[PDB]
Structures are given as structure tokens and as C-alpha cells.
Chain A
Amino acid sequence: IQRTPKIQVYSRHPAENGKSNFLNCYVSGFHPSDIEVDLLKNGERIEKVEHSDLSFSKDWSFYLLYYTEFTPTEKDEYACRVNHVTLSQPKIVKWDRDM
């Protein structure tokens, strides 16, 4: 069975520019477990990104939360890039602060 990952990019606390916050990329609903997720700030990949221990839900598919501490500004765009065997190309979903 191979299931495509579902992805959400969001802030731990509602974002206000200039205040440190956290950027989560929750990837869920996938199988197999090998998936590459990395948070990109302005296209550049961020290092110093942490992530949870791999677990699965009821239908046996996996999910993982990747995160980094960040401080929004107006100028900086953030995104989460994900690449998995079901994906013909990696998926870059950008952070929107209203979602």
C-alpha cells in the first residue's frame, strides 16, 4: 500500500511580526515511512529543525511534525518541502499566516 502524504504548515501561536514563534510542518496520511521533509526559509533550507518520533494512526499510516523556532517578519517567506515515493516531484507548501 502506498499513500500520499497530507501536509499542513502553521505557527504554534498566532503570528505577530518580531515575536519568536514556532513553525510546524505536520505531514500525515502516508506510507511508506521514508519521507524527506525540510523547512525552507526564503528557499534556503533551514537547519536546526527538530521533529517528533514516528508514529502511525488507525489506518496504519504515518505522521510526523517538523518544527523550527522562527520570528515572522513581513519580508520573509517560509515553506515546507516534502518528497516521498508517491510524489513525482517534491511538494513545497508555503506558510500562510491565516491558516
Chain B
Amino acid sequence: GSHSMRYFFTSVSRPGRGEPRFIAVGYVDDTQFVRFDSDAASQRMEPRAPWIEQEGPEYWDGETRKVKAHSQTHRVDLGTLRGYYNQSEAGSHTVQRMYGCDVGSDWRFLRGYHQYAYDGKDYIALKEDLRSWTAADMAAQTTKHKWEAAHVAEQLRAYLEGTCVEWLRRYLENGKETLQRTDAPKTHMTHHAVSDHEATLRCWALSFYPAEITLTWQRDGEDQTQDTELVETRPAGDGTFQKWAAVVVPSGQEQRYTCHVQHEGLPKPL
């Protein structure tokens, strides 16, 4: 199965007084496992999943050290970026960094990515090929000139093909019980009469993991899209996800309609 690890970094300047706020979140597939928040007393990379708590203090002192390195390079980054776009000193700006690697079914390296945005939009992102950078702007073009010169992309290839895969593989072994355990959806449907002549069929898929689910309705065996409301997959708050898809039906015809649930933890359901 394809697994992955991603680090989401957010930096917001606080113009009035102080440092910019920094949050770093780590995830292995749809599971959060570490966090760092600047407005937190620990001032440490803290665990957020049972299975990473096993890690000795050489890990927590080394992750804290690093996440802090990072907060500081985005503090500098927010200053640079304001010169480059020539902006005023007393507004906030967000920089956001994203990196990680996916591995495939053979547990070998599959894809790697390191992107970066400023104020909502793409700034510079490394390519799939891990050798060039896509600069979206002429400010980002300054940064691509610097990173090409400095051989930044090669420094990252080694981490995304080495350290990243290495540590994703152990997170999966130490976390076997949950990280490699798919919870197929628990489905059920409800029926709610909108009127005397129409009903809503809501097809509910609850308590599943991963979050990727396909909910599609069908009438007389052909897929139906018309008069189908559907929701964004939401987190239940316990590590699983919920989603439902509804359809309005003529009352008396609901036999025609079937919900088809698609999900990794399932041999397909109707």
C-alpha cells in the first residue's frame, strides 16, 4: 500500500509586537503524530500519537532543535518576502512550507515534494523530478536563482529519498496496529420525507480510515448526479472520518436507488 509523511509549516507575522507565530504539524498518512506551536509553554516538538511516544529523548531534543531552526528561517523569510514584493511593515503575511515523500506498495520511494507559498498563493515548489524548481513569480525567480546556485534541490533529494523513507518505514513498523489498519466504513442510510411526494435518501459512511472514500448513488443501475447533495469528508475527531451523500427521490421509488461505497478497506459495497 502507498504510505506517506508530510510536514505542514505555518508562519504568521505579528506586526504590532513580537515574533511571527509558528505551527509545525507532522502527519503519517491521515494521522497527525507531532506538533510544535510557538505560543506553547513546552517550546518543544510534542508527540501527538501513541506510537511515536516510544521515541527516546535523543529524538525529542533533536526534533525540537530542528523545528526551531525552521521557525527562525521563516522569520527571516517573512522579512525577505516583504522587500521582494515591497510591502508595508504593519500587516501580517503568512509563509507556508510543505514537504514530504510517498512510498509505494513495495515500501520503496515513490514521489517526493517540497513546496512553499506566501499569502495564499504558490511561491516556489520543487519539481516531481526533484532537479528543478517551478517559480511562480519574479520574486520567486530571485529565490530560484539563489537555490540553483546553492544546489538546494540536491540537498533535498537526499533527504526526500533517504531520511524521509527511512523514517516513514519505522513509523509504520512502530505503528503497525493503527497505521497499517484500514477501518472500512460502517454504512447505513436514512430516509427523510421533504414533502408528501419526495424523500431524501442519505447514504452515511462512518468510522473509516484512510479518509479517501467514494460515495456515489445510482438509479436503475446507472449513476446519478442530478439532485445529489454530498459533503466534504470530515474528521470525526477520534482518528476516523465520516461522509454522507444524499439524493432526492419520488416517494415510492426509493427501491431504484442504491448507494455505492468505494474504500481501500472494502471489496466494493452497494
Contact = CB atoms under 8 A, between A and B. Distances in A.
A53 B119 contact: no
A53 B37 contact: yes
B8 interface: yes
20 contacts: A10-B242, A22-B237, A24-B236, A26-B234, A26-B235, A32-B92, A32-B120, A33-B12, A53-B25, A53-B37, A53-B48, A54-B23, A55-B8, A55-B10, A55-B23, A56-B8, A56-B96, A65-B237, A99-B202, A99-B231
Given A8-B232, A12-B236, A56-B8, 16 more contacts: A1-B121, A8-B231, A10-B242, A31-B120, A32-B94, A32-B120, A53-B23, A53-B35, A53-B37, A54-B10, A54-B25, A55-B23, A56-B96, A60-B120, A65-B234, A65-B235
Interface range on chain B (Cβ under 8 Å from partner): 20 to 34
Interface in A1-59: 1-3, 6, 8, 10, 12, 14, 22, 24, 26, 28, 31-34, 52-56
A98 interface: yes
A26 B233 CA distance: 10
Interface string B75-111: 0000000000000000010101010000000000000
Contacts of B237: 12, 22, 24, 65, 67
Nearest to A8: B234
B238 interface: yes
Nearest to B204: A14
A25 B88 CA distance: 35
Nearest to B122: A60
B139 to A, nearest CB: 15
